[PDB]
Amino acid sequence: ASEAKQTVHTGNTVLLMIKGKPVGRAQSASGQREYGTTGVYEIGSIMPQEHVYLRYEGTITVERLRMKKENFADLGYASLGEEILKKDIIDILVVDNLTKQVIISYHGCSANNYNETWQTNEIVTEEIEFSYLTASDKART
Amino acid sequence: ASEAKQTVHTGNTVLLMIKGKPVGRAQSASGQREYGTTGVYEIGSIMPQEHVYLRYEGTITVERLRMKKENFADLGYASLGEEILKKDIIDILVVDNLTKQVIISYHGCSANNYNETWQTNEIVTEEIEFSYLTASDKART
Amino acid sequence: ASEAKQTVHTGNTVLLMIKGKPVGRAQSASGQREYGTTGVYEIGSIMPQEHVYLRYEGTITVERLRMKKENFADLGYASLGEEILKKDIIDILVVDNLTKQVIISYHGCSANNYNETWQTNEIVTEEIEFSYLTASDKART
Amino acid sequence: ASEAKQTVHTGNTVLLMIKGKPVGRAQSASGQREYGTTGVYEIGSIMPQEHVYLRYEGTITVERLRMKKENFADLGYASLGEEILKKDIIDILVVDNLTKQVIISYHGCSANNYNETWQTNEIVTEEIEFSYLTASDKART
Amino acid sequence: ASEAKQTVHTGNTVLLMIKGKPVGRAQSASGQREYGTTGVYEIGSIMPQEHVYLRYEGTITVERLRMKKENFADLGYASLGEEILKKDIIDILVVDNLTKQVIISYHGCSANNYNETWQTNEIVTEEIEFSYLTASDKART
Amino acid sequence: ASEAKQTVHTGNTVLLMIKGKPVGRAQSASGQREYGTTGVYEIGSIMPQEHVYLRYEGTITVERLRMKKENFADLGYASLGEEILKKDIIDILVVDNLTKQVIISYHGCSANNYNETWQTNEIVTEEIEFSYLTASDKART
Amino acid sequence: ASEAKQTVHTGNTVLLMIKGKPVGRAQSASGQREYGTTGVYEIGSIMPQEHVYLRYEGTITVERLRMKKENFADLGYASLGEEILKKDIIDILVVDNLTKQVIISYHGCSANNYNETWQTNEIVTEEIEFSYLTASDKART
Amino acid sequence: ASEAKQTVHTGNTVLLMIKGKPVGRAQSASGQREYGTTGVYEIGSIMPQEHVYLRYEGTITVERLRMKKENFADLGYASLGEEILKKDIIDILVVDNLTKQVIISYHGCSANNYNETWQTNEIVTEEIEFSYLTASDKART
Amino acid sequence: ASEAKQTVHTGNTVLLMIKGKPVGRAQSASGQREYGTTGVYEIGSIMPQEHVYLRYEGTITVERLRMKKENFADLGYASLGEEILKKDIIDILVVDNLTKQVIISYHGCSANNYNETWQTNEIVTEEIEFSYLTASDKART
Amino acid sequence: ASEAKQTVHTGNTVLLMIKGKPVGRAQSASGQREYGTTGVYEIGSIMPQEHVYLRYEGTITVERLRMKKENFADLGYASLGEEILKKDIIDILVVDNLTKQVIISYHGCSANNYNETWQTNEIVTEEIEFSYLTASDKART
Amino acid sequence: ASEAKQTVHTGNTVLLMIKGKPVGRAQSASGQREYGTTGVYEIGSIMPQEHVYLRYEGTITVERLRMKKENFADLGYASLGEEILKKDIIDILVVDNLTKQVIISYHGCSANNYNETWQTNEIVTEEIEFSYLTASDKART
Amino acid sequence: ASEAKQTVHTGNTVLLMIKGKPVGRAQSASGQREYGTTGVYEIGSIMPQEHVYLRYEGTITVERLRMKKENFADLGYASLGEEILKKDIIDILVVDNLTKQVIISYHGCSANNYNETWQTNEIVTEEIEFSYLTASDKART
Known part of the structure; x- marks a missing residue:
């Protein structure tokens, strides 16, 4: 029941931190990875003899409510134009809210797409996706 | 609580302005961008060595209730025929309702598709999409 | 509130007219257009230099409840067989119910598909699509 | 005060007349109408800019003590089986007892449901509902 | 007034007869019918042009004091287990006590649910519902 | 205490005035308002960080005894048929009986539904609902 | 009339017996059954052609005053924790007080929910529900 | 209201007839056609110069509840095996239930796919599709 | 017993104070809170392994007799129109009548809805609801 | 009969004890449990073949008069803000007044909601709900 | 109503039999067939001249609740590994529950895919698909 | 009813075991297999002459709530980086909770993709997929 002895991670127990600073108003984060597994067959066999890895891929998606003064563009993470070429690789960290220890770390994140949504009677929604070399x-360090 | 100290942008706090004039009856606006990120691999590696940008794309979609006298066709923004070729590039601006400052600016918007909807017991819906060179x-200026 | 000063078009304020005659029992009408916009890139650039129009397309879809004596086949608009080849181009007009003025006009409409639906406990539904040269x-005239 | 100069209508001052003949033993009659009002909102305004009418609906309910020889089924106003399909639209008129002037008139009434109830020591109750186009x-007619 | 010339029916003037034999200790009986009326609207008209019938439904509910030897289960009208599949359709007739003339007749009644209740200091109540095709x-039959 | 120095308002100290004339035989009047408050949550915080307003709504309901000559239909405030489309917005004012000072004012009221009821031995009841923009x-006006 | 020749059952003439022993302090017992009747319609016929049975369901509810030593938990009929998984199906029999003849028998009863209530100045009430296969x-058994 | 003067076709007003015999338990029928319309462009034009028809197609789908003795296989319309090659072309007719006049006629229907569905607690569903040369x-004749 | 040594609180021993001033003519006040508790289940265990908190919510409702000069609108606590956007968060304090010690404190209250009612022969009732972050x-503050 | 030999429990014979100390001024206590029973059906059998348990749930509700110094918040059983996360699971025991023997024990109770109410001339009522794993x-423990 | 005279097949009236043994706990069975119909055109024609059959296909899908001792793997119908090659063709039969006569017979069924599903609080679901040469x-025999 | 005689497997009756250790907080497991069945045709035939197996495939998907100290990464089953190449093949076993006997065994499982989800007010969700040589x-052993 108490957060101390809870055995399953929940939203309130983790913090989204980028470059040593927490990300405010974060709503959902989804991370995906692909090892490019393929099956190896044989002339006189009907089942794969072995499985091998050929290509590694990874993507992390972050959704937020667009802050007035702390959105990705202001922080220099998102790019609206040619400044993307000037942006250097960044690391995204997910840490426990209690001990601040790192649970999952994304290395060399690179932006892929950036989206924003506006509606008459809803909060502004911000979406962005990144590609990381390793996790x-x-x-x- | 009060709009002055609100930390998250909302619909009422922003205005859709085109050529220095607000857009009335705007319902939803969705903007998307793509940096064309690709992974670079190596003969003796299983993970991308680097990520590079190859193609930049951007699209902005606007939905409105068809005004009797202030719809896109009347304002000269939308084209129903060969007049599209005569239309020059336009800029779409999103500004804060309070300070009128520009939050996101779309440069060189060009129309891609224009749609309208009619129904027996619903308000006429107008949809249009644009492509902008830069944001x-x-x-x- | 009153229909006279209403600023947004609604279903009751517009009439679907074909060849100078209103279309009865019309339910929904959807019109779409495509300008075939494409981006022009450069060898030493990462963003489109210009946008051009290459192909113009347009389609109008009409849905109705199949009338006993005033359906499209009876009026000579829809074709169930080889008579389609004998059908000449037609114009579809949307006019204000009050002033009868033309709001959107479709020129050279040509049928593409014709569909009908029958159900045990529902009204017969009629669907048809047209392609128009210009709007x-x-x-x- | 006296009935001839009463300020408001009462139960005995109104007679339910159908097809030129009064309806006997009427206990209650509730008429409902709806205009389907909807609000129109704007991107930059929290308040609704205006309201419009999009769906008109109305119903009339009649309750009576089941007459031995002058009930709805005998008069042909109600239906129990296939005869419903042969029933023509009827008009329900509420007229002043003294002057017989029409107060509320329902045009194009169409039956929706018919209900009856039997009890050991209570008067048989007859209920029916109708849907009309305009009032x-x-x-x- | 006298029963022989009463203007409306009452509890003791109607007998519930099933398969040629009266039903004893009947407490209540509610018959419901529905025609599934729906409105037909037009693009240029707010009001419904006309109403049509699309779904006919009806149900009859019977409540009785559980007879020691003449309850529904003993007479085979109700069902408790697999015997429901072997039950044939039955007709429920409401007839005048004096003349035995048929007032309301239900054809093709089919059982829907069967309910019973027991209490420390109240008479056992028996309830059952049926669905009929036409009335x-x-x-x- | 005396009415002139009563601490709170009562039934007879408030007069319902529409278009400069008091409304007679008013029985009840309920005004409702809504701001559509929503909570803003954060990934690392269980509690809602702040609340914002996103959907403003309001309604006013009026109940009266159906006047013989001064009911809503006669005054043109209500509607029964096509005349609803021609009805202009009206303002409902609640004023003090003595000083006639405005206490609550409704601007841009628009009718939503109109209801009436008739009974054998009860006074005819008139009910109507309106939707207003701001109060x-x-x-x- | 005398109990020995009473026309209908009453509260004291029925004993709730479970596993060969009567249930003491029974206050109420409601048995419900359902056959899932559905109508079969045809394209050219408004009326339902026939009705069929597709989903059989039934439930029995028992209410009692919580016995100090002979309540459901002590007898093992109810469950509070993991012991529910070890409970075997039981049969509930309603028998005549005098002749002990079985009137209603429930086969394969399975517990659904168990409820209890405590109050400052009211007798403790015990409630439980069971689901049976056939009756x-x-x-x- | 009455079926005689109804202006919109409904399910009960039409009958599905094949080879002069009505189809029982028909649920839904959907017919689709395609004229293969294509646009003709020009070197120095941005819009289609003309529209032409290149290919004609048509399909009719019928859904039914599988009859015990009058399903498609028994009638010889559907084929479960090699007998399909022996089946000759058939004509499907939709006629008004009142006058029996033909509304839509399908000529040279040829089966394309045949499907059946079985479920624990639902009526057996039968589906089949046909291709017709002309309509x-x-x-x- | 005496008020000074009463075992539990009562109506007159608690004063509703807002912004340092007591609220007069308070009739009722209901405070609600929710923690959004959810159960965690396991594949091999029927019972919930543990419960966690995922959604905190709370609301406070206040009902009063509408003061002539000290109602919510006059004090600026409530809102009727655009002024809601300018309302700052307020705290509602429940304090002991004698010692003025704070018993329940609401922080960051935000208005949700505002309601009023008028009747011919009843005291005007004022109702309002607020949403607070933490208590x-x-x-x- | 005498309390020492009463056949059933009553209000004063049960004491609500939490963490080894009785709960004073308890007005009501309702305990609910659910096993999520579901029926298993077969293709060829209408009746359910068997029932299984798939979702265990339970809740306990406690109502009390708000003690001046021994209410839930003071004892730390309830929560008003962030302190809920620090609350450890507690057990609620219902014991006989005389022998103190445990009758019903709740293990791992977790708070779900906390409610309070204030009224002008009624005793303050305190309500709270808990969710437990097993009973x-x-x-x- | 009764199963004997029912005109439409239902689930309970049919049994899924494989190799002369009924399949228990069957939930849904879906069978599909394709005749590979194609249209034949002509140089100087706009409509298909004839329709021919080119390829015959058929598939039957069966869903069940995984039995502890009578699942497909135990019966030798499904294969989890290389034993599939040793499996011989099997025939699936659907027979009337009453007369046991064969309604639809699948000849030479061959497995294509086999799937199983596990969930925390749901019954284990088993799915499998087969391909049959003829039906x-x-x-x- | 009781778990001992239950005929259909359920979630609580099975355990997900990997390398001799149960998997905690498992939510759903889905296993799929494909035999690569293909049809063999003949020049003078319209139906497949025989069916053969050409390729064997299999995949198992596991979903869990991310444990703080017993998630896949900690157990060494999932790989977040280059350590995947160092991971050896593993076997996933599903066993009966009662007898611990193996029901389905996956041999040579190899990871394909690994995903994690984070949300503001939901439990952290973990997803992973594996490919196994044989089952x-x-x-x-």
Whole structure:
């Protein structure tokens, strides 16, 4: 019941941190990875003899409510124009709210698409996707 | 609570302005961008060595209730025929309702598709999409 | 509130007229257009240099409850067989119910598909689609 | 005060007349109408800019003590089986007892449901509901 | 007034007869019917042009004090287990006590649910519901 | 205490005035308003960070005894048929009986539904509902 | 009349017996059954051609005053925790007080919910619900 | 209201007839046609110069509840095996229930797919599709 | 017993104070809170392994007799129109009548709805609802 | 009869004890449990073959008069703000007044909602709800 | 109503039999067939001249609740590994529950895919698909 | 009813075991297999002459709530980076909760994709997919 002895991670127990600063108003984060597994067959066999890895891929998606002064564009993470070429790789960290320890770390994140939504009677929604070279359970350094 | 200290942008706090004039009866606006990110691999590696940008794309979609005298066709923004070729590029601006400052600016918007809907017991719905060369957080000039 | 000063078009304020005669029991009408916009890139650029129009397309869809004596086949608009080849181009007009002025005019409409639906406990539904060479905000003549 | 100069209508001052003949033993009669009002909102305004009418609906319910020889089924106003399909539209008129002037008139009434109840020691109750197209204070059919 | 010349029916003037035998200790009986009326609207008209019938439904509910030897289960009208599949359709007739003339006749009644209740200091109540195809004022089966 | 120095308002101290004339035989009047408040949550915080307003709504309901000559239909405030489309917006004012000062003012009221009821031995009841854009304590139209 | 020749059953003439022993302090017992009757319609016929049975359901509810030593938990009929998984199906029999003949028998009863209530100045009430497969007027297990 | 003067076709007003015999338990029928319309462009034009028809197609789908003795296989319309090759072309007719006149006629229907569905607690559903060479508003002969 | 040593609180021992001033003529006040508790289940265990908190919610409702000069609108606590956007968060405090000690404190209250009612022979009733972020037994703002 | 030999429990014979101390001024306590029973059907059998348990649920509700110094908030059983996350699971025990034997024991109770009410001339009412994992007739923690 | 005279097949009236043994706990069965119909055109024609059959296909899908001792793998119908190659063709029969006569027979069924589903609080679901060379309305032998 | 005699497997009756250790907080497991069945045709035939198996495939998907200390990454089953290449093949076993006997065994499972989800007010969700060379009803050794 109490957050201390809870055995399953929940939203309030984790914080989205980028470059050592928490991300405010974060709503949902989805991370996906693909090892490019393929099956190896044989002339006189009907089942795969072995499975091998050929290509590694990874993507992390973040959704937020567009802040007035702390949105991605203001923080320099998102790019609306040619400044994307000037942007350097960044690391996205997910840490426990209690101990601040790193749970999942994304290394070399690179933006792929950036989207914003406006509606008459709803809060402004901000969406962005990144591609990371590698992921690890500890900090990069 | 009060609109002055609100930290998250909402619909009522922003205005859709085109050529210095607000857009009336605007319902929803969706903007999307693509940096064309691709992964670079190596002969003796299983993960991307680097990520590069190859193609930049951007689209802005606007939905409105068809005004009797202030719809896109009357304002000269939408084209129903060969007049599209005579239309020059236009800029779409989203500004804060309070300070009128520009939040997101679309430069060189060009129409792609134009749609209208009619129903027996519903308000006439107008939809249109544009493609912009570049986007920035400040005014073009 | 009153229909006279209403600023947004609604279903009751417009009439679907074909060849100078209103279309009865009309339920929904959807019109779509495509300008075939494409982006022009450069060898040493990452963003489109210009946008051009290459192909113009347009389609109008009409849905109705199949009348006993005033359906499309009886009026000579829809074709159930080889008579389609004998059908000449027709113009579809949408006019204000009050002033009868033309709001949107479709020129050279040509049928593409014709469908009908029958159900045990529902009204017979009639659907048809047309392709028009050009569209304008005024009458053809 | 006296009935001839009463300020408001009462139960005995109104007679339910159908097809030129009064309806006997009428216990209650509830008439309902709806205009389907909807609000129109704007991107930059929290308040609704205006209201419009999009769906008109109305119903009339009549309750009576089941007459031995002058009930709805005998008069042909109600239906129990296939005969419903042969029933023509009827008009229900509410007229002043003294002057017989029409107060509320229902045009094009169509039956929706028919209900009956039997009890060991209570008077048999007859209920029926109708749907009408338009209502007016003066008879027109 | 006298029963022989009473203006309306009452509880003791109607007998519930099933398969040629009266039903004893009947407490209540509610018959419901529905025609599934729907409105037909037009693009240019707010009011419904006409109403049509699309779904006919009807139900009859019977409540009784549970007879020691003449309850529904003993007579085979109700069902408790697999025997429901072997039950044939039955007709429920409401006839005048004096003349035995048929007033309301239900054809093709089919059981829907069967309910019973027991209490420490109240008479056992028996309830059952049936669904019939068509109803008429004259017996036909 | 005396009416002139009563601490709170009562039934007879408020007069319902429409278009400069008091409304007679008013029985009840319920005014409802809604701001559509919604909570803003954060990934790392269970509690809602702040609340914002996104959907403003309001309605006013009026109940009266059906006047013989001064009911809503006669005054043109209500509608029974096509005349609803020609009805202009009206303002409902609640004023003090003595000083006639405006207490609650409704601007841009639009009818939603109109209801009537008839009974054998009860006074005819008239009910109607309206939707207004904004409300204020001082008259402005 | 005398109990020995009473026309209908009453509260004290029926005993609730479970597993060969009467249930004491029974206050109420409601048995419900459903056959899932559905109508079969045809394209050219408004009326339902016939009715069929597709979903059989039934439930029995028992209410009692919580016995100090002979309540459901002590007898093992109810469940509070993991012991529910070990409970075998039981049969509930309603028998005549005098002749002990079986009137209503429930086969394969399975517990659905168990409820209890405590109050400062009211007798403790015990409630429980069961689901059975089939019911019959004669015991078979 | 009455079926005689109804202006919109409904399910009960039409009958599905094949080879002069009505189809029982028909639920839904959907017919689709395609004229293969294509646009003709020009070197120095941005809009289609003309529209032409290149390919004619048509399909009719029928859904039914599988009859015990009058399903498609028994009638010889559907084929479960090699007998399909022996089946000759058939004509499907839709006629008004009142006058029996032909509304839509399908000529040279040929089966394409045949499907059946079975479920634990639902009526058996039968589906089949046909392809017809031509369609007309009158009988083939 | 005496008020000074009463075992439990009562109506007159609690004063509703807002912004340092007591609220007069308070009739009722209901405070609701919710933690959004959810159960965590396992594949091999029927029982819920543990419960966690995922959605915190709370509301406070206040009912009063509409003061002539000290109602919510006059004090600026409620809103009728655009002024809602300018309303700052307020705190509602429940304090002991004698010691003025804070018992229940609501922080960051935000209005949700405002309701009023008028009747011919009843005192005017004022109702309003607020949403607060967190609650505590000691004042903090 | 005498309390020492009463056949059933009553209000004063049960004491609500939490963490080894009785709960004073308890007015009501309702405990609910659910097993999520579902029926298993077969293709060829209308009746359900068997029933299984798939979702166990239970809740306990406690109502009390708000103690001045021994209410839930003071004892730390309830929560008003962030302190809910720090609350450990607690067990609620119902014991006999005389022998103190445990009758119903709730294990792992977790708060769901907390409610309070204030009125001008009524005793303050305190309500709270808890969710527990398993229940037993003997204490185990 | 009764199963004997029912005109439409239902689930309970049919049994899924494989190799002379009924399939228990069957939920849904879906069979599909394709005749590979194609249209034949002509140089100087706009409509198909004839329709021919080019390829015959058929598939039957069966869904069940995974039995502990009578699932497909135990019966030798489904294969989890290389034993599929050892499996011989099987015939699936659907027979009337009453007369046991064959309604639809699948000849030479061959498995294509086999799937199983597991969930925390739902019954285990088993799915499998087969391909049959031919289908007939009678038994293979 | 009781778990001992239950004939259909359920979630609580099975355990997800990997490398001899149960998997905690498992929510759903889906396994799919494909035999690559293809039809063999003949020049002078319209139906497949025989069916053969050409390719064997299999996939198992597991969903869990991300444990703080027992998630896949901690157990060494999932890989967030280059450590995937160091991971050896693993076997996933599904066993009966009662007898611990193996029901379905997956041999040589190899990871394909790994995903995690984060949300503001929902439990962290973990998803992963594996590919296995073979499956059997008994243990590998």
